[PDB]
Design an enzyme around this catalytic site. Structure first.
Site, short mmCIF file in Angstrom:
data_model
loop_
_atom_site.label_atom_id
_atom_site.label_comp_id
_atom_site.label_asym_id
_atom_site.label_seq_id
_atom_site.Cartn_x
_atom_site.Cartn_y
_atom_site.Cartn_z
N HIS A 165 0.84 -1.19 0.00
CA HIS A 165 0.00 0.00 0.00
C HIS A 165 0.88 1.24 0.00
O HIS A 165 2.11 1.16 -0.10
CB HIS A 165 -0.98 0.01 1.18
N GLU A 175 0.81 -9.20 8.66
CA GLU A 175 1.26 -8.07 9.45
C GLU A 175 0.70 -8.25 10.85
O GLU A 175 -0.37 -8.84 11.03
CB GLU A 175 0.79 -6.73 8.84
ZN LIG Z 1 -0.55 0.24 6.76
ZN LIG Z 2 3.36 -0.50 7.82
#
Ligand SMILES: [Zn+2]
Ligand SMILES: [Zn+2]
Lengths: 407, 700, 426
Positions: free
Chosen positions: C63, C198
């Site tokens: 992103h 993540e």
């Molecule tokens: Zn992020």
């Molecule tokens: Zn990050």
């Protein structure tokens, strides 16, 4: 057995005796030998001055037709109704509806105004069908869905276009025509794996051209001339490459900012065709179209053989000024043979064939994933192309006009 | 800082505190490395005895976090970089215990890669004097580096290797450290494990490229049989570290004046290494003049021959044919490395005297035509290169870069025609990728300026280039319209005055497509079309009210790059003296500095101050400076939100009554350091570490 | 086998440059960054993979956050990579406006030593092949990539990388909370070998209501509001709150906005509508000028440099202060060097040039508007993908320990959480 017919590779009437037919396609490459419809010499080419006759494949016992596409359908009433045939046709309704659209617009194209040594067969070219035969043929169609059994003959979802399916037959014989790994619903290639005989009639007619590169090369020199003050003529079908053209032409309007140009679309079945998808539909050339002509327009006419349709008007009108342009997006008809009865053309002739079908790399990938016992292909897809020195024939028999091979 | 330093020394080891920021600790380490240069570190450690208390707590408290452990180890290493501070840090047995068993090396926190990579850095910070050498030798502090040479972390292994290199190169200035190190190196070059051989070669590479002295000659003599015995191993071990060792040994001629077996180690290596590593070694050999020409000829004939299985198979040994036809991956890799190494060897003076310019251009054109079709096969090798290498983007990029860098070599005009006739075919190919089109535009640009009047047969290339340029300016991708506008800018900067570039450009529809791109959706394509139509209108090829469109873009546009590009275009319009901005010098600057002043952007205001610099350099009258700038926008800009904009004003005003009160030099001295200077200071860092007010790291 | 080395961020947030080697293909799975550091430590260490053009098949940018794309115009055009970089279509547009703001922070933070220029930003963007969601892109004959919908920020995708049957999907910065903005993450049953998640919210509407209550309280008693944001980060999420609540209870008091590198929220919303609505598978907010904040009475301003980096935000915050009715809302981390860390750490005496201690008597509030998957969402994504091993490359190691314990406890899978430079082997 496979009693082949219609030696064109993408438009096969492969009568698979067992007695089934694998497709009912019409070559239509004969119509490029005739003068337009608004023997004579035209820029050194001799032309038959009559109705443009059609290359019928060279039928009372072939009880089943497994029609697969809508470019590959347009021989249907030639063998269904007027020929002494009693039987059935199967497809899916997204195929059948926009096939019927093309046949109805073709009858509209022809009955509104009612290489010769190298021609493969002239004694079999017959005149066009009529609307009653079209409706009688389309009344014999029994709609079936994807992956639904009808011997066990099942269609499978393919990735070419809307309703474009490819079939398999169990005992095992499979079949491919009009398939695409880049895309419509993607290919159902999982059930293609376990096979004994395979057919690959549907492949690209321009294998050395990336289809995305050709879409970009269509939009680029469309915008080059509509920004030059000139029009664009796209000879294409109401259903087919036009939807892929338009879903990227809208994106090109969004991306490059090409606006304030009117996208038109002229076909007698186009109003019934757009619902399958700025594009200002008008139904013909004589009527409300003559009053709503903005000069940098982009008209999408009805037939790319450049004798039928409203396109003949636009080539006889625009074909003298260099600002106007024609972009050939069809992988079926010749760039140069269809342009033959107009050849003193100042108008920019451009060949940008968008073919999303299988290039030989993914053909070999699919054959590796499938691992068939035998593979049957057109004779042009077993030897390298006559225009290239590459290695672009699939490595893994062959067929020709009226060739009856046995497996 | 020094007042808060005992407080932070109490905080760091305090278990009641939360974990300190691993950026705060490293900034403290940077501060301490800064301060322990101008002051004696033992004086510093005497004046603030909280630091030895921190280190003794590290020796004493078993539950510190990894960050503070690494901080204290590197801090001890930083202080004990002098001998006197080393013995002062041993009065309580800190340093033997910090780096030995009593420290983190003998407990569970040694498992953290942060602690190991802090231990290595602390040692490398302290191992700088003979007392450190004795401490390393006697206590076994070199065996631990021998173990950590093969650590899991690539940050710890590549630091243990350089710690070994540093310990070796400082001990030799046969001492026990310098002999045990090279005993392990010699044992590892005879090992059957690729990691150990790689580590030994990575130690020898560094210690041979770092120091040139007789003991390095003795090392090379005693290790070159062991090095040469690696080429008889199947497969070859650590081929790139081997090649690096050979090209760092051979670049110093003091090792070829030793036993000659270096040049026979290279000579066999160019004939026995795998196809991936003959290229780097061959290029490194050809990059230096010390090798024998008998070796150099074989070194260059193993570089060319990938570009000689193409020339002998298209235009109608197996050690490269088996590589060029094995797969698209192998062929693509071999040709990319070959053309890259010839890009590196092209502009050198070390190149061979018969540089095969014509044959190299033929091979490059052939590779390009193999990629974009129409490359006829003269054999079955050509028939595999035509289908293996067709539509290969990466080899096309490498070949286009090489054909760009074949421009510098002078040659006949047939070479230029042959290059351009395939650069154009790459431009007008429908399947050419945007990156391939960027490469092809840059390569065409390099090949056009190397044609010395712009030359015969070049205008007929312009009339065939522009009908491709127009079609590229209407490309669906913004990268290609951007690349075409960059090409037009960089071609109208060179021959903008040439007859056949003003006669043949306006005869196309490029200017009326470079003007329609000012309204392109992408801000990049608006920006590179503003700079395009400044360069197009600097030389008079506009194809009037361009100024009002540009001022409209500067005023009401909804992006930044168009306004930056527009202020840049006025900047060179006023530098150059373009007629639109030179028919009325005062009024133009007046109407543009209101657009510059009210911006929400900093580079646009900086370009406005650059434009005020241009106006003030044009003037030297003072009434002309009484307009919307040159005395007013600068005064506001001194207190601007941005240091570069403020500094641009202070530098402008240094170059009237209100101008007297402004302390300019003090303002510049303030506006020369960081904007973070009041917070990268020691005191602010200490306060940020001591902040207990409170309110987790996340994404920016 | 598969060998994964987190080149910069395996057990810390920042410098995300995770590297994956599968059968013959090396891929770079972000090019992160680090604020704070100002000299070559802001970027990952590119010395552990040497040429890069011949070695690295793909670069994949998850992103547009600056800790996932910050080094990309440095890695491409300083280190020397000439290849394909694969960003989703929104990310390719937001990124050159996010990275032209770090160049401003660094230009005045005097840290432009080994750093990317604006021309280098454009050149790095011109090497990008912007993919669509759920589209399989071929980079080699056998290696393909496929982007997904992560639902974290405008352009977040969960890229799958596959050769033959072996594969790995990097789910960089997704979300699993369908809120009044970008929705939740969807990944189908790819069933890969490795899932590189993540783990920022490892051990993890109230903020939606509290943000509007806290601006509503201090625009009706004459105070003023400053929201320090980046250019196209999370400001565009707060703009629709300040339009939706201000439809309900207007008060018609001003709301300003100021970037300079873009429009208020329209180029964001040309992309937000098709990305949010199709691709899963205003009059209140106005413009701001540098002198438009001296106007008395209530006001709400969004400022251009996030985190109280020295710029518009620092001046406006320095100028509201002294009034206890005024207020500032922190939605971001505010790294150590910044004034934002100083004021949300607890300090109210701050220094500047000379000796000018600023008596910060503003109200100070911090509502973290970061849309990451919490504890439950991470295991729900792992359940969606059903992988053979899980990798953790974002977040702090203390929480990643517990996430490892849970994702090894209930879901019988092997979880690795390597440090920077550690190579894990499958
Ligand atoms: Zn992020
Ligand atoms: Zn990050």
């Amino acid at each position: 057995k496979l009693y082949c017919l219609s030696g064109h590779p993408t438009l096969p009437c492969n009568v698979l005796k067992f007695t089934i037919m694998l497709d009912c396609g019409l070559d239509m490459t004969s119509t490029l030998n005739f003068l337009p419809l608004p023997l004579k010499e035209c820029s050194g080419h001799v032309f038959v001055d009559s109705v443009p006759e059609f290359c019928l494949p060279e039928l009372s016992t072939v009880d089943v037709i497994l029609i697969s596409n809508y470019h590959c359908m347009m021989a249907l009433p030639y063998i269904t109704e007027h020929t002494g045939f009693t039987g059935t046709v199967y497809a899916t309704e997204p195929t059948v509806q926009i096939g019927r659209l093309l046949m109805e617009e073709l009858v509209n194209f022809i009955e509104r105004v009612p290489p010769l040594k190298d021609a493969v067969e002239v004694s079999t070219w017959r005149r066009c069908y009529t609307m009653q035969e079209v409706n009688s043929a389309l009344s014999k169609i029994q709609l079936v869905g994807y992956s639904q059994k009808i011997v066990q003959v099942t269609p499978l979802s393919s990735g070419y276009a809307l309703g474009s399916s490819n079939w398999i037959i169990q005992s095992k014989v499979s079949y491919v025509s009009g398939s695409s790994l880049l895309t419509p619903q993607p290919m159902d290639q999982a059930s293609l794996k376990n096979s004994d005989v395979l057919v690959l009639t549907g492949l690209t007619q321009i294998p050395t051209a990336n289809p995305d590169g050709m879409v970009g090369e269509f939009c680029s020199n469309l915008a080059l001339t509509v920004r030059n003050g000139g029009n664009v003529l796209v000879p294409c079908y109401p259903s087919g490459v036009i939807y892929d053209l338009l879903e990227c032409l809208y994106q090109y309007i969004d991306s490059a900012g090409l606006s304030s140009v009117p996208l038109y679309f002229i076909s007698p079945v186009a109003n019934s065709s757009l619902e399958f998808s700025k594009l200002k539909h008008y139904p013909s050339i004589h009527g409300d179209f003559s009053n709503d002509f903005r000069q940098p327009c982009v008209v999408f006419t009805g037939h790319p053989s450049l004798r039928f349709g409203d396109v003949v008007h636009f080539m006889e009108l625009w074909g003298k000024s260099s600002l106007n342009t024609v972009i050939f997006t069809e992988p079926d008809f010749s760039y140069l043979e269809a342009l033959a009865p107009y050849q003193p053309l100042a108008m920019k002739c451009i060949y940008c064939p968008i073919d999303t079908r299988l290039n030989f790399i993914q053909v070999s990938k699919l054959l590796k994933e499938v691992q068939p016992l035998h593979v049957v292909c057109p004779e042009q897809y077993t030897q390298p192309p006559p225009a290239q020195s590459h290695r672009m024939d699939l490595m893994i028999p062959a067929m020709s006009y009226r060739r009856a091979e046995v497996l | 800082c020094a007042q808060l330093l005992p407080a932070l020394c109490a905080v760091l080891v305090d278990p009641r505190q939360p974990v300190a920021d691993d950026t705060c600790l490293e900034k403290l380490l940077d501060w301490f490395k800064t301060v322990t240069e101008g002051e004696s570190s033992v004086v510093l450690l005497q004046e603030h005895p909280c630091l030895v208390e921190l280190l003794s707590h590290v020796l004493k408290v078993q539950d510190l976090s990894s960050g503070v452990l690494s901080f204290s180890l590197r801090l001890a290493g930083t202080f004990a970089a002098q001998e006197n501070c080393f013995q002062y840090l041993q009065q309580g047995e800190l340093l033997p215990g910090l780096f030995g068993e009593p420290g983190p090396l003998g407990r569970a926190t040694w498992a953290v890669p942060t602690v190991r990579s802090g231990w290595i850095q602390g040692l490398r910070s302290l191992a700088q004097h003979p007392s450190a050498l004795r401490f390393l030798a006697d206590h076994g502090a070199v065996d631990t580096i021998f173990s950590l040479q093969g650590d899991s972390s690539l940050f710890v292994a590549s630091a243990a290797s350089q710690l070994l290199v540093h310990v070796l190169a400082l001990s030799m200035r046969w001492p026990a450290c310098a002999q045990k190190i090279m005993d392990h190196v010699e044992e590892s070059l005879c090992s059957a494990a690729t990691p150990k051989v790689t580590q030994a070669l990575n130690v020898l590479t560094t210690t041979f490229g770092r120091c040139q002295s007789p003991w390095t000659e003795a090392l090379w003599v005693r290790l070159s049989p062991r090095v040469a015995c690696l080429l008889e191993r199947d497969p070859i071990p650590a081929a790139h570290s081997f090649v690096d060792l050979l090209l760092c040994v051979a670049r110093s001629p003091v090792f070829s004046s030793s036993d000659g077996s270096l040049w026979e180690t290279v000579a066999r290596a160019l004939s026995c290494l795998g196809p991936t590593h003959m290229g780097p070694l061959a290029l490194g050999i050809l990059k230096l003049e010390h090798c024998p020409q008998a070796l150099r000829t074989q070194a260059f004939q193993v570089l060319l021959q990938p570009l000689a299985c193409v020339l002998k198979a298209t235009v109608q040994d197996a050690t490269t044919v088996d590589t060029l036809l094995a797969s698209k991956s192998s062929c693509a890799g071999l040709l990319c490395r070959t053309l890259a190494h010839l890009e590196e060897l092209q502009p050198l003076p070390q190149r061979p005297s018969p540089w095969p310019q014509a044959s190299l251009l033929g091979a490059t054109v052939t590779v390009l035509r193999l990629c974009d079709g129409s490359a006829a096969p003269a054999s079955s090798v050509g028939g595999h290169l035509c289908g293996t290498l067709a539509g290969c983007v990466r080899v096309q990029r490498a070949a286009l870069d090489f054909l760009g860098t074949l421009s510098q070599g002078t040659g006949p005009q047939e070479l230029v025609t042959q290059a351009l006739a395939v650069l154009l075919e790459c431009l007008e190919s429908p399947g050419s990728s945007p990156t391939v089109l960027k490469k092809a535009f840059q390569a065409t640009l390099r090949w056009l300026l190397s044609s010395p009047d712009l030359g015969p047969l070049i205008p007929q290339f312009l009339r065939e280039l522009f009908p491709v340029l127009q079609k590229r300016l209407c490309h669906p991708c913004w990268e290609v319209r951007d690349s075409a506008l960059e090409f037009l800018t960089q071609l109208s900067r060179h021959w903008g005055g040439q007859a056949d570039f003003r006669c043949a450009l306006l005869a196309s529809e490029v200017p009326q497509l470079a003007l329609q791109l000012l309204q392109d959706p992408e801000s990049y394509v608006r920006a590179s079309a503003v700079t395009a139509m400044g360069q197009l209108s600097s030389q008079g090829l506009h194809a009037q009210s361009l100024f009002l469109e540009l001022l409209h873009i500067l005023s009401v546009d909804s992006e930044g790059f168009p306004r930056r590009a527009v202020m840049q275009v006025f900047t060179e319009w006023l530098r150059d003296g373009h007629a639109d901005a030179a028919q009325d010098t005062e009024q133009f600057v007046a109407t543009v500095l209101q657009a510059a002043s009210r911006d929400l952007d900093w580079e646009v205001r900086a370009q406005g101050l650059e434009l005020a610099l241009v106006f003030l350099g044009q003037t030297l009258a003072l009434r002309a400076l009484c307009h919307v700038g040159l005395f007013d926008f600068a005064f506001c800009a001194l207190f601007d939100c941005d240091r570069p904009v403020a500094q641009k004003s202070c530098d402008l005003l240094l170059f009237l009554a209100m101008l007297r009160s402004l302390d300019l030099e003090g303002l510049r001295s303030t506006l020369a350091e960081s904007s973070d200077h009041v917070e990268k200071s020691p005191q602010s860092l200490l306060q940020d570490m001591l902040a207990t007010g409170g309110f987790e790291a996340d994404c920016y | 086998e598969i060998r994964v080395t987190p080149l910069g961020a395996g057990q810390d947030v920042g410098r995300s440059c995770i590297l994956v080697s599968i059968a013959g293909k090396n891929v770079m799975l972000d090019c992160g960054m680090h604020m704070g550091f100002n000299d070559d430590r802001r970027f990952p260490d590119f010395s552990y993979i040497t040429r890069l053009t011949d070695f690295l098949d793909c670069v994949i940018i998850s992103h547009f956050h600056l800790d996932h794309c910050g080094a990309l115009p440095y890695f491409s055009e300083m280190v020397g990579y000439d290849g394909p970089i694969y960003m989703t279509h929104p990310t390719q547009a937001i990124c050159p406006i996010l990275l032209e703001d770090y160049r401003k922070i660094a230009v005045d933070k005097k840290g432009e030593a080994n750093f990317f220029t604006s021309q280098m930003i454009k050149d790095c963007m011109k090497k990008v092949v912007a993919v669509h969601l759920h589209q399989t892109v071929q980079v080699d004959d056998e290696l393909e990539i496929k982007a997904y919908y992560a639902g974290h920020v405008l352009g977040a995708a969960m890229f799958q990388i596959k050769v033959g049957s072996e594969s790995v999907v990097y789910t960089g910065d997704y979300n699993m909370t369908p809120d009044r903005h970008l929705g939740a993450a969807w990944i189908d049953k790819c069933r890969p070998n490795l899932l590189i998640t993540e783990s920022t919210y490892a051990t993890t509407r109230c903020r939606e209501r509290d943000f509007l209550k806290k601006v509503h309280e201090t625009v009706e008693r004459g105070g003023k509001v400053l929201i320090p944001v980046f250019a196209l980060g999370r400001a565009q999420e707060l703009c629709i709150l300040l339009e939706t609540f201000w439809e309900r209870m207007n008060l018609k008091v001003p709301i300003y906005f100021s970037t300079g590198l873009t429009e208020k929220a329209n180029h964001y919303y040309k992309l937000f509508i098709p990305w949010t609505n199709q691709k899963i598978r205003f009059k209140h907010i106005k413009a701001f000028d540098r002198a438009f904040a001296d106007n008395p009475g209530p006001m709400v301003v969004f400022a251009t440099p996030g985190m109280l980096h020295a710029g518009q935000s620092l001046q406006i915050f320095r100028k509201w202060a002294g009034n206890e009715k005024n207020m500032v809302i922190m939605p971001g981390y505010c790294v150590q060097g910044t004034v934002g860390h100083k004021i949300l750490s607890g300090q109210r005496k701050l220094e500047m040039e000379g000796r000018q201690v600023l008596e910060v008597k503003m109200q100070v509030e911090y509502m973290s508007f970061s849309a990451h998957a919490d504890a439950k969402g991470i295991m729900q994504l792992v359940g969606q993908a059903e992988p053979e091993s899980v990798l953790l490359v974002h977040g702090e190691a203390k929480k990643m320990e517990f996430l490892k314990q849970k994702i090894e406890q209930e879901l019988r899978v092997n979880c690795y959480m390597p440090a920077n430079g550690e190579t894990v082997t499958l």
